[PDB]
Structures are given as structure tokens and as C-alpha cells.
Amino acid sequence: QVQLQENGGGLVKPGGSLRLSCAASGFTLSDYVMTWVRQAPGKGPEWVSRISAGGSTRYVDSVKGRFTISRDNAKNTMYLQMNSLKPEDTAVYYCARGSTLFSTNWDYRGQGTQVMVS
Amino acid sequence: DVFEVEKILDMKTEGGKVLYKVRWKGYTSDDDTWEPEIHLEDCKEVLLEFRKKIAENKA
């Protein structure tokens, strides 16, 4: 069965750092386009960063120069390094398994992990 | 930024996978990656043209 589990969140002061992980099982990460998504309370879902099956990465403009996405193929785990955190970064972060490079649509997503910047 | 294909560079069909080497718009040759055909199905006619051309060049 396909599974996705996120961890690494918590409370952090403005300017602090967090390293989120997304552990996968039942499939190989490098076979899909993986996406980090976040949703702040009272707002809609927004994608943060994606990594292609080939290893190409792209970030939303509000996190450019602060967030870094990566994946350990030997772990089958995806990481999101969050530096210089701002209160606007408060949201639930979840990873999603996609199969299209031009849409962020997915079939499986994790349940998410909370990030509270305060 | 988005995943925008600027040019299909090469193609291989080995190891139980169909892969295309792509040149990304706004990026350099140091960023070229190999991507599965399933993930590029929104440029199906570009891929079809490259498949026929690389088949004739190999022949």
C-alpha cells in the first residue's frame, strides 16, 4: 500500500529553521513528481516546491532563497529545509505524489505536519 | 518558476523506462535532467516528433 508520513514540524521563532521530512513506502520517490504543499488557517492550499523524477527543482517565489527541497533515494524520503522562517510561513505542510510536470495534481498525499512560526 | 521545456535534447528507452533529456526554459545546460515520458504527456506531439526524428537518425 502507498503511504506518506510527514514529520519535522513544530513551534519555531521568527528567523529560526526547520527541516521537514516525508517518508514514503509502497512506491519509489524518483518515479514521481513530488510536491510540498502548505495551507495556512483561513487560506487555500498553495504549492511550495517540487522536485522532478530527474531531480529538477522549483520553488514558489515567496520561499526562493530560504527553502530547499531534496530527496534521499536510499531512504525513499523527501526533505524540505526551511531557513529564515517568517510568521507568514505558518501552515500545515504535506507532501503529494504527482505524475505531471506541468500540473501539481496528485493522487496520494500525506496527512501533513504543523509549522507554527511564533 | 514552473517546469517549462525549452528543448528536448535526447532520448533513451532502457531499463524498463522511456526517458527524455530536457532543456529547461530559464536554466542552463548544467540543469539538464532525464524525465519519464509519463510526466511529459502534455507535450505529446513534441515527443512524437522527436521519437520519429531520432528513429530516422539512428537508421
Author numbering:
A (entry chain A): 5 to 122
B (entry chain C): 57 to 115
Original paper wording:
Nanobodies as crystallization chaperones are well-established but still unreliable, as we show here. We further demonstrate that these Gb mutations do transfer to some other targets, both for achieving robust crystallization in alternative packing forms and for establishing the ability to crystallize a key early stage readout.
Gluebody mutations have also yielded crystals for noncrystallizing proteins. The successful case, the MPP8:Gluebody complex, diffracted to 2 Å and the structure was readily determined. The Gluebody mutations M125 and K14 mediated the inter-Gluebody crystal contact and revealed yet another Gb-Gb interface that is not observed in any of the RECQL5:Gluebody crystal forms. This interface only involves three pairs of residues, too small to have been included in the Nb interface classification discussed earlier; notably, two of the three pairs involve modified residues, meaning they have a prominent role in the crystal contact. The MPP8 chromodomain is a best-case scenario, where the Gluebody assists in finding new packing forms: the protein crystallizes well on its own but not with the wild-type nanobody; it requires the Gluebody mutations to generate the alternative crystal form that may be useful for screening purposes. While Gluebodies led to high-resolution structures for only crystallizing proteins and showed limited capability to rescue noncrystallizing proteins, especially intrinsically highly flexible or dynamic assemblies, they should provide better opportunities to crystallization via more crystallogenic target-independent interfaces.
